[PDB]
Structure formats: structure tokens, C-alpha cells
Amino acid sequence: MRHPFKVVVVTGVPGVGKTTVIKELQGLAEKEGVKLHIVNFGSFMLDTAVKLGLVEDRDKIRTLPLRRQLELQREAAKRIVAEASKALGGDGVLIIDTHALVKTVAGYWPGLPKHVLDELKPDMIAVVEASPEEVAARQARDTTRYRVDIGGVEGVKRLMENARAASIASAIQYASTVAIVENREGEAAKAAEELLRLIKNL
Amino acid sequence: MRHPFKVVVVTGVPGVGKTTVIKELQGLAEKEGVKLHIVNFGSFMLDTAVKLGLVEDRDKIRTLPLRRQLELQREAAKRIVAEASKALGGDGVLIIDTHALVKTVAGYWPGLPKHVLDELKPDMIAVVEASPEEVAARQARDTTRYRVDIGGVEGVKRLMENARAASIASAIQYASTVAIVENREGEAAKAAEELLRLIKNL
Amino acid sequence: MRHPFKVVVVTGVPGVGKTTVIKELQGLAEKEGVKLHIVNFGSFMLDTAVKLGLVEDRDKIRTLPLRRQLELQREAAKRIVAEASKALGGDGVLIIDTHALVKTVAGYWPGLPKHVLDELKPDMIAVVEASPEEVAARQARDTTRYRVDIGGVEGVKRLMENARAASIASAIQYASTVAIVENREGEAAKAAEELLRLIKNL
Ligand SMILES: Nc1ncnc2c1ncn2[C@@H]1O[C@H](COP(=O)(O)OP(=O)(O)OP(=O)(O)O)[C@@H](O)[C@H]1O
Ligand SMILES: Nc1ncnc2c1ncn2[C@@H]1O[C@H](COP(=O)(O)OP(=O)(O)OP(=O)(O)O)[C@@H](O)[C@H]1O
Ligand SMILES: Nc1ncnc2c1ncn2[C@@H]1O[C@H](COP(=O)(O)OP(=O)(O)OP(=O)(O)O)[C@@H](O)[C@H]1O
Ligand SMILES: Nc1ncnc2c1ncn2[C@@H]1O[C@H](COP(=O)(O)O)[C@@H](O)[C@H]1O
Ligand SMILES: Nc1ncnc2c1ncn2[C@@H]1O[C@H](COP(=O)(O)O)[C@@H](O)[C@H]1O
Ligand SMILES: Nc1ncnc2c1ncn2[C@@H]1O[C@H](COP(=O)(O)O)[C@@H](O)[C@H]1O
Ligand SMILES: [Cl-]
Ligand SMILES: [Cl-]
Ligand SMILES: [Cl-]
Ligand SMILES: [Mg+2]
Ligand SMILES: [Mg+2]
Ligand SMILES: [Mg+2]
């Protein structure tokens, strides 16, 4: 079970370069006439959380009580699909910038649980990956975002292993591909090209 | 989808110290006024198996034909939730001492398959972990339990890797957290404190 | 939820020796009077794809657009169960020669997604394994099949790790066992005996 448009969920650990690679994919897509609608799942959760006076910062969402995060995750998924449905026809691709596994105050939490996959029905779960050392250096240089709680090189390495396993488990629900995209240091454009090529085979 | 009470499923390989850490969590919980109802999933399966004359020993359950184990697993999950429902209100936590993966006579068998998760609806799957060598030494010193079939250090190591993967797959169904709890040699009380802290963020 | 017959899904990477080990299991089964019905999931997909003029070669199926592969996978699973239902009673075992993870043109693709498991309801997912080096040498010596796209020793190693994780995730849906069967060089008959022994405990 599939939407009329294609759905690509882009995951990977905080700081790996998802939002960067997606911004490169946007330029490449419009150059080649491929129709995208691009959203950030976290921005949809932040919108609701800010309205409820729960947080002001996207990096505090994962510190909320988990039953509250569950409600924000459910509502974000439904709003994303309603918006995608108005923006895209059968020739379009929904790109969702998100996480397969979130490091919360009560443990590793699936970003693509069954209730979310029942809304998104992904054609593909892309996993953006780099070395733990590369990810830790990208986190250090990016002072716009708080990622110290991910636990530097050792925390990144563990989250990456658990996140790969979550991506595969989530793929079983709607027979999503799992596409591993290497985001090599200084080569975000090349990651975006490899991702586009896989998207064209969906 | 959630019960009115919180549900914490405590997994880890045989001999790792689940039942020990849960006994420490019970003391700490009652000291801090946190309401628990604590069950052992295997004890619920043993009750039915003994009534049917199938086994007399909890360590022989995993040697039954798998269609029989499937029936005992289904009934144990339903009985646990019926009992929890009478014991707990919205301020309580159900603690289920169990396994994400059981080493049976027909291979590794999920302890938290979808039919079980549809009953338990876990807020959290805690994974109690130690080194394979620590687990093998704990099994050797505990002569109350038969665990030789788990396969000592090498068998424990493999089951641990497969069990981590099963815990994450099971977490996708109801967006359960996966909380890794280190049960360090001689520090079961500290594992119980780390678990309690995560439980309070559910 | 179970068929009246037992269902064993036999997975492992291309070239590992699934079809070989199953041919040995067939001889051993008929020698011991164990009733099997044996199918190849890919042959069911090839039948439909050839009728539609899509491919002529079983090794090109994984190069089709993924929405097309999804339709062929759904139809293959339904046809297999309809045929098994006419061939087997409650004393029989359906053996399905297939894959937990297929390396496609749009990434790693689950062979046992939920829509497939809802048809097959496996008692067991057997994982046939060997060293990546053994698998790469078996692929080189077998010129009847195209497997260069799996990526030799390094590609085999990665697919094997991801395929193990997919097998476990797929096992959660219907509480299937996961039985790891070592297909050691020159000992396909012994792998078939170990598999038969596990099958008899279902
Ligand atoms: N291939 C690359 N090489 C070098 N720097 C990169 C690369 N890709 C991204 N970066 C940088 O890494 C930092 C993190 O990138 P980005 O914000 O896109 O990560 P993210 O995965 O979206 O993280 P979050 O999940 O926290 O939103 C940024 O400063 C970005 O410019
Ligand atoms: N942190 C610890 N350090 C040392 N010994 C421990 C620790 N935790 C538990 N033990 C001991 O390890 C042995 C196994 O513990 P326990 O029976 O609680 O394991 P379990 O995980 O419940 O096993 P099963 O799954 O077989 O029931 C016991 O003798 C127990 O006292
Ligand atoms: N244990 C073994 N030792 C040596 N060679 C083996 C062994 N098992 C299988 N082979 C050989 O390995 C090659 C691949 O075997 P086979 O075709 O059965 O693999 P497969 O897993 O069914 O692959 P595919 O998934 O591509 O169909 C064949 O030439 C086969 O004879
Ligand atoms: N699929 C998801 N499920 C749950 N929480 C999510 C998901 N995607 C994003 N988030 C949350 O949103 C925050 C901000 O998103 P991001 O900008 O991608 O880091 C993350 O740190 C998470 O707390
Ligand atoms: N969730 C479960 N699913 C299936 N079998 C279980 C489960 N939990 C416990 N068991 C069985 O019960 C036995 C005794 O439980 P324990 O005392 O935790 O070792 C285990 O060895 C298993 O055979
Ligand atoms: N369960 C499955 N799901 C999807 N594709 C499959 C499945 N089983 C087999 N295939 C496809 O069928 C081809 C031929 O099967 P095989 O002969 O086992 O290699 C594989 O290379 C795949 O492209
Ligand atoms: Cl992720
Ligand atoms: Cl476990
Ligand atoms: Cl496979
Ligand atoms: Mg981002
Ligand atoms: Mg115990
Ligand atoms: Mg074959």
C-alpha cells in the first residue's frame, strides 16, 4: 500500500547531514525537472509543541515525556500526508527529513513506528551515514543545533548501529527499500546525486 | 496505543540478571512511592504448561513444540493484561520480566511478536545487558536454573546480538522506547536506579 | 496465526546455497517419510514478469521499478499459498526458497514484508549462512546465475548483516522462529540435516 505520489523518508543520526543533503537534492531535482515536496518531520512536531507552550527549541522535543512525544509524532505524520496530498500528483515525490531512531530521555525511540508508517506508506527509507568521527566533527562545527546529548563519537556510533536496525524493522511494514547513502566529508552534492538515482528506480 | 497504566517489558539473555535488577527496582520504587505491578511472563506460561502436564520446569518450556509454545505465549500475555488492569490505575507501572528472543529447539523465537505486543502495548522495552563473560559466570554460579543450552560465552554473545535486533523490531509496533540498562558486576542496584529514572520519563 | 500445514521460509544471500540445501532436504525428507511441498518465490515472480514481457531472466527481476516488483511479490505470495493449500494437509511442510532482503536498483528491499507474511504466516524463517569469502567463491563457480551486482565479498558481507536484521524484523509479525543454518563448504547435506531437525520441532 502506496500513495499516488512516491514517499521517501530520509533518516540518519543527528549531525550526519540529512537537511544538507536534502537541500542539495532539491537543487538537483529542480535542474532535472523532478517534482519534490520536502518537509521536516521535527518542524511539524515543533509547530504543535510551541502552540501548546511545551518547548521553544527543536532539540528539546526529545526531552518531553514520551506519551506527549507520541501524540506530537502521530499528529505530525497526519498533517504531513494531508499537505503532501494537496501539493503532489502521481509524478511527485514527498521527501521527509526525519529519524528512524530518536535518543530520548526514556531510551532509543522509533521515529517510524507502525502508526507513522500507516500514514506515510514509504516507498523508501534512505539512511544517510558517515563515520562516527565525521558526524562528531560536523556536530562540533554546527553551533546552530544542540547535539551534545547524542554522546559524541561513542554515542553516535551506538545510535547509528541501533538506527540501522530500526530502519530495517520499519521497512518490513510497507515493503520500503532501505537505501544507504554515504555522506562523505565535503561531498554532500554526490550523496544527493546517489539518492536521486535510487529515487528514480522506485 | 497505550494502556491507562505504563507498561515496561524487561528483556535480556538468560542469566544477565533481569529478575535480580527487577527485585532491586521493587525496593527502590516502594522507597520513592512509585506504584509497580511486577509479573514474570515465563511464570504465566509455566502455570498453564504444568496444568496441561507438559513440563514441570520453567527451563523446559523452550523445548516444547513451537505451536504449543505459541498458544502458551498468547494466553500468558492476555492473563497478564487482565491482572494488571485490576491491580493498577493511571499512576501505576506494569513491569514484565521476559525475553525479546528465546533460544528454542526450532531456533531463536520472538518473545514480543505482534500478537503479544497487541496485548501489552509497551511504553518501553528495557534491554538488560552485561559482557558475555559476565553473563556466562552469572549462569555458572546460579545452580537454581538450567542455562547450559544457551551455549556459554559464545552462545550468549550471539543470542545478545539477535535479541538486541528483536527488541528494536518489536519496538516499531507500538513506538516503545528501547532502553539499554548495563547490569555491571556487583551493581544490580545501580542498574535498577538507571531503569527507574528512564521509567519516570515515559 | 498459522496455516494447517507448517510453513518454512528459507532465506540467505544470493549464492549461499539455499536451492542446493533445499534439494538435499528434499532427499532426506522423502527418505524419512516427511511430506514437503517445495516452491521458489522468485520462480513465481518470474512466471508473471515473463507473461507481462517485463524480463526474461530471474536475475533481472530486482532491476524492475520497485512498484512493479511490489505487485509481482504480492501476487507470488498469494499463488504460493493457494497451491500449497491444495497440495498439503496438516502433516505437511511448505518450503519456500526465497530472500529476507533483495539488493534492488532502489536499495535493500524486504523479501518478507508484512503483506507477504500475512499470506505465508511462517512457522520458521531459516537463514542459510556461510563466510562472505565462501559465498563469493560459490557465486564465481556458478556461471548459470548473474550475481556480480551483489558486490563480491564486501557486498555479500553487508547484505548478510542487513538480511539477518530483516529476518528478525519479519519474524516479529507471526512469531516465526529464526533458525541460522551454516552451509559449510562441501557439507550441504549436513546443513539439510540440521534444518530438518529444527523443522521437526515446529
Ligand atoms: N558531506 C558533508 N561534509 C561536511 N560537512 C557536512 C556535510 N553534510 C553536512 N555537513 C555539515 O554538517 C552539519 C550538520 O548538517 P545537518 O544540519 O544537515 O545535519 P542533520 O543530519 O539534518 O542533523 P539533525 O538531525 O540534527 O537535523 C552542518 O554544519 C552541515 O553544514
Ligand atoms: N549485577 C550483578 N552482578 C553479579 N551477579 C548478578 C548481578 N545481577 C544478577 N546477578 C546474579 O546472576 C544470576 C542470574 O540472575 P537472574 O536469575 O536475575 O537472571 P535472569 O536474567 O532473570 O535469568 P532468566 O532469564 O534465566 O530468568 C543470579 O545468581 C544473580 O544473583
Ligand atoms: N555447502 C556447499 N559447498 C560448496 N558449494 C556449495 C554449497 N552449497 C551450494 N554450493 C554451490 O554454490 C552455488 C550456489 O548455490 P545455489 O544456486 O543453491 O545458491 P542460492 O542461495 O539458491 O542462490 P540464489 O539466491 O542466487 O538462487 C552452486 O554452484 C552450488 O552448487
Ligand atoms: N519521526 C520522528 N519521530 C519522532 N520524533 C521525531 C521524528 N522526526 C523528528 N523528531 C523530533 O524532532 C526533532 C527535530 O528534528 P530534526 O530537525 O530532524 O533534528 C528531533 O530531535 C526529534 O526530537
Ligand atoms: N515473552 C515470552 N515469549 C515466549 N516464551 C517466553 C517469554 N517469556 C518467557 N518465556 C519462556 O519462559 C521461560 C521462563 O522464563 P524466565 O524465568 O524469564 O527464564 C523462558 O525460558 C521461555 O521459555
Ligand atoms: N520474497 C521475495 N520478495 C521479493 N523478490 C523476491 C523474493 N524472492 C525472490 N525474489 C526475486 O526473485 C529473484 C530470483 O529468485 P532466486 O532464484 O531465489 O534468486 C531474486 O533475485 C529476486 O529479485
Ligand atoms: Cl536515524
Ligand atoms: Cl532477550
Ligand atoms: Cl536473504
Ligand atoms: Mg536536520
Ligand atoms: Mg529471571
Ligand atoms: Mg536459488
Side-chain angles (χ1 to χ4, degrees):
Chain A
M1 170 86 206
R2 284 301 181 266
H3 292 285
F5 45 88
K6 291 179 186 159
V7 174
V8 176
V9 174
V10 178
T11 72
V13 299
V16 71
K18 294 176 301 294
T19 303
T20 303
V21 164
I22 289 158
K23 174 58 64 188
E24 290 285 338
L25 173 74
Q26 181 182 9
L28 200 69
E30 86 203 348
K31 234 95 276 99
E32 307 205 353
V34 169
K35 290 183 188 178
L36 302 186
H37 183 74
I38 301 172
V39 300
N40 179 292
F41 197 105
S43 299
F44 277 75
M45 296 175 72
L46 180 59
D47 190 55
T48 311
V50 157
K51 266 162 230 185
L52 296 174
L54 293 175
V55 297
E56 219 194 294
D57 160 11
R58 64 198 302 110
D59 286 306
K60 284 295 215 280
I61 298 174
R62 60 192 179 258
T63 70
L64 290 168
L66 266 295
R67 288 194 179 194
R68 174 67 75 178
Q69 300 193 47
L70 182 61
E71 293 176 8
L72 298 172
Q73 180 189 63
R74 169 178 313 102
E75 213 247 340
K78 291 176 153 91
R79 284 168 58 214
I80 283 167
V81 165
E83 170 181 294
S85 282
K86 294 200 192 74
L88 293 176
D91 60 352
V93 190
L94 179 59
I95 306 294
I96 307 171
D97 183 354
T98 192
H99 299 261
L101 204 66
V102 182
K103 187 173 180 158
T104 75
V105 285
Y108 294 118
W109 186 49
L112 300 173
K114 174 189 187 297
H115 77 85
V116 169
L117 293 166
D118 292 334
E119 290 297 327
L120 308 183
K121 307 177 189 320
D123 290 84
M124 168 187 284
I125 298 159
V127 182
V128 183
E129 273 180 8
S131 74
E133 294 81 10
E134 275 158 3
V135 172
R138 291 177 195 170
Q139 293 175 346
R141 165 192 313 283
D142 186 1
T143 59
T144 71
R145 291 295 300 281
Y146 180 84
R147 311 184 174 105
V148 184
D149 62 313
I150 306 314
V153 181
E154 197 44 49
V156 162
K157 187 175 183 292
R158 282 181 219 291
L159 177 60
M160 286 177 67
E161 277 149 13
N162 296 132
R164 171 78 75 91
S167 289
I168 295 163
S170 283
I172 286 348
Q173 291 292 317
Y174 284 81
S176 307
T177 64
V178 181
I180 313 306
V181 176
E182 299 290 335
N183 192 21
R184 294 202 181 78
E185 192 72 6
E187 304 191 68
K190 180 158 174 147
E193 289 168 324
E194 171 45 349
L195 177 49
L196 189 51
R197 175 42 99 257
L198 297 163
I199 288 173
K200 290 173 169 177
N201 287 98
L202 289 172
Chain B
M1 170 86 206
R2 284 301 181 266
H3 292 285
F5 45 88
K6 291 179 186 159
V7 174
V8 176
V9 174
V10 178
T11 72
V13 299
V16 71
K18 294 176 301 294
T19 303
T20 303
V21 164
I22 289 158
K23 174 58 64 188
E24 290 285 338
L25 173 74
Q26 181 182 9
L28 200 69
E30 86 203 348
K31 234 95 276 99
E32 307 205 353
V34 169
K35 290 183 188 178
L36 302 186
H37 183 74
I38 301 172
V39 300
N40 179 292
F41 197 105
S43 299
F44 277 75
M45 296 175 72
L46 180 59
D47 190 55
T48 311
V50 157
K51 266 162 230 185
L52 296 174
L54 293 175
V55 297
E56 219 194 294
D57 160 11
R58 64 198 302 110
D59 286 306
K60 284 295 215 280
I61 298 174
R62 60 192 179 258
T63 70
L64 290 168
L66 266 295
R67 288 194 179 194
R68 174 67 75 178
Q69 300 193 47
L70 182 61
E71 293 176 8
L72 298 172
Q73 180 189 63
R74 169 178 313 102
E75 213 247 340
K78 291 176 153 91
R79 284 168 58 214
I80 283 167
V81 165
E83 170 181 294
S85 282
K86 294 200 192 74
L88 293 176
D91 60 352
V93 190
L94 179 59
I95 306 294
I96 307 171
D97 183 354
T98 192
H99 299 261
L101 204 66
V102 182
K103 187 173 180 158
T104 75
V105 285
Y108 294 118
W109 186 49
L112 300 173
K114 174 189 187 297
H115 77 85
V116 169
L117 293 166
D118 292 334
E119 290 297 327
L120 308 183
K121 307 177 189 320
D123 290 84
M124 168 187 284
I125 298 159
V127 182
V128 183
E129 273 180 8
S131 74
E133 294 81 10
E134 275 158 3
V135 172
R138 291 177 195 170
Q139 293 175 346
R141 165 192 313 283
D142 186 1
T143 59
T144 71
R145 291 295 300 281
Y146 180 84
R147 311 184 174 105
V148 184
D149 62 313
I150 306 314
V153 181
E154 197 44 49
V156 162
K157 187 175 183 292
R158 282 181 219 291
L159 177 60
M160 286 177 67
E161 277 149 13
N162 296 132
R164 171 78 75 91
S167 289
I168 295 163
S170 283
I172 286 348
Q173 291 292 317
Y174 284 81
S176 307
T177 64
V178 181
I180 313 306
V181 176
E182 299 290 335
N183 192 21
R184 294 202 181 78
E185 192 72 6
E187 304 191 68
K190 180 158 174 147
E193 289 168 324
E194 171 45 349
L195 177 49
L196 189 51
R197 175 42 99 257
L198 297 163
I199 288 173
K200 290 173 169 177
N201 287 98
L202 289 172
Chain C
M1 170 86 206
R2 284 301 181 266
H3 292 285
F5 45 88
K6 291 179 186 159
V7 174
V8 176
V9 174
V10 178
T11 72
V13 299
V16 71
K18 294 176 301 294
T19 303
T20 303
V21 164
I22 289 158
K23 174 58 64 188
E24 290 285 338
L25 173 74
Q26 181 182 9
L28 200 69
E30 86 203 348
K31 234 95 276 99
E32 307 205 353
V34 169
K35 290 183 188 178
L36 302 186
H37 183 74
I38 301 172
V39 300
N40 179 292
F41 197 105
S43 299
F44 277 75
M45 296 175 72
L46 180 59
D47 190 55
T48 311
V50 157
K51 266 162 230 185
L52 296 174
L54 293 175
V55 297
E56 219 194 294
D57 160 11
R58 64 198 302 110
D59 286 306
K60 284 295 215 280
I61 298 174
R62 60 192 179 258
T63 70
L64 290 168
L66 266 295
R67 288 194 179 194
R68 174 67 75 178
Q69 300 193 47
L70 182 61
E71 293 176 8
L72 298 172
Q73 180 189 63
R74 169 178 313 102
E75 213 247 340
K78 291 176 153 91
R79 284 168 58 214
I80 283 167
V81 165
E83 170 181 294
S85 282
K86 294 200 192 74
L88 293 176
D91 60 352
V93 190
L94 179 59
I95 306 294
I96 307 171
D97 183 354
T98 192
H99 299 261
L101 204 66
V102 182
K103 187 173 180 158
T104 75
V105 285
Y108 294 118
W109 186 49
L112 300 173
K114 174 189 187 297
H115 77 85
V116 169
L117 293 166
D118 292 334
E119 290 297 327
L120 308 183
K121 307 177 189 320
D123 290 84
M124 168 187 284
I125 298 159
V127 182
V128 183
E129 273 180 8
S131 74
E133 294 81 10
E134 275 158 3
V135 172
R138 291 177 195 170
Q139 293 175 346
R141 165 192 313 283
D142 186 1
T143 59
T144 71
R145 291 295 300 281
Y146 180 84
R147 311 184 174 105
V148 184
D149 62 313
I150 306 314
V153 181
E154 197 44 49
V156 162
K157 187 175 183 292
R158 282 181 219 291
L159 177 60
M160 286 177 67
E161 277 149 13
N162 296 132
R164 171 78 75 91
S167 289
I168 295 163
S170 283
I172 286 348
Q173 291 292 317
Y174 284 81
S176 307
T177 64
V178 181
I180 313 306
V181 176
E182 299 290 335
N183 192 21
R184 294 202 181 78
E185 192 72 6
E187 304 191 68
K190 180 158 174 147
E193 289 168 324
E194 171 45 349
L195 177 49
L196 189 51
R197 175 42 99 257
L198 297 163
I199 288 173
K200 290 173 169 177
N201 287 98
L202 289 172

